[PDB]
Amino acid sequence: HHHFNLPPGNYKKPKLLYCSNGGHFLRILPDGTVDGTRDRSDQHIQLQLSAESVGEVYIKSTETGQYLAMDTDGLLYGSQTPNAECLFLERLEENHYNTYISKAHAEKNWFVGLKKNGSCKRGPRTHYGQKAILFLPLPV
Known part of the structure; x- marks a missing residue:
């Protein structure tokens, strides 16, 4: 139960998710670890977002097919298959x-x-107001 201000744009094409905080692109590594990199030539930063329901999305690595997910203890990881831990509420x-x-x-x-x-x-370390949670979706 959160606000419903939605960002403009669509899911037709893959995107890079650029984090304002350190200027890193969100990266899902083949081994399933997730982190960020400033290297624009990286092959694991290209992400395809898709909507499950309005405002709910899956975020998938186009290179490995892994889905971004957050586990029970708040750690991001790459999932081989889509499940409830892979859905995110995308908001402006x-x-x-x-x-x-x-x-x-x-x-x-x-x-x-x-x-x-x-x-x-x-997860628990994130909070509204931080620059760490702010992303700009850039075309690939």
């Missing part, structure tokens, strides 16, 4: 950015977030 933030809240943990406001050093934040 500060009238500009896109934020992604774990649907499975939405009551706790757990977001997808990247620290300035490029490591992911754990």
Whole structure:
């Protein structure tokens, strides 16, 4: 139960999710670990988003087919198959950015977030107001 301000744009094409905090692109590594990188030539930062229901999305690596997911302890990981831990509520933030809240943990406001050093934040450590949760979807 959150606000419903939605970002503009569509899911027709893959995107890079650029984090304002450290300037890192969200990356899903083949081994299933998730982090961020500033290297625009990286082959694991291309993500295809798709809508399950209005405002609910899956975020999938086009290179490996892995789905971004957040586990029971708030850690992001790459999932081989889509499940309830892979759905995120995509919303507009500060009238500009896109934020992604774990649907499975939405009551706790757990977001997808990247620290300035490029490591992911754990769910409980994310909070409205941080730069770590702010993303700009860029064309590939």
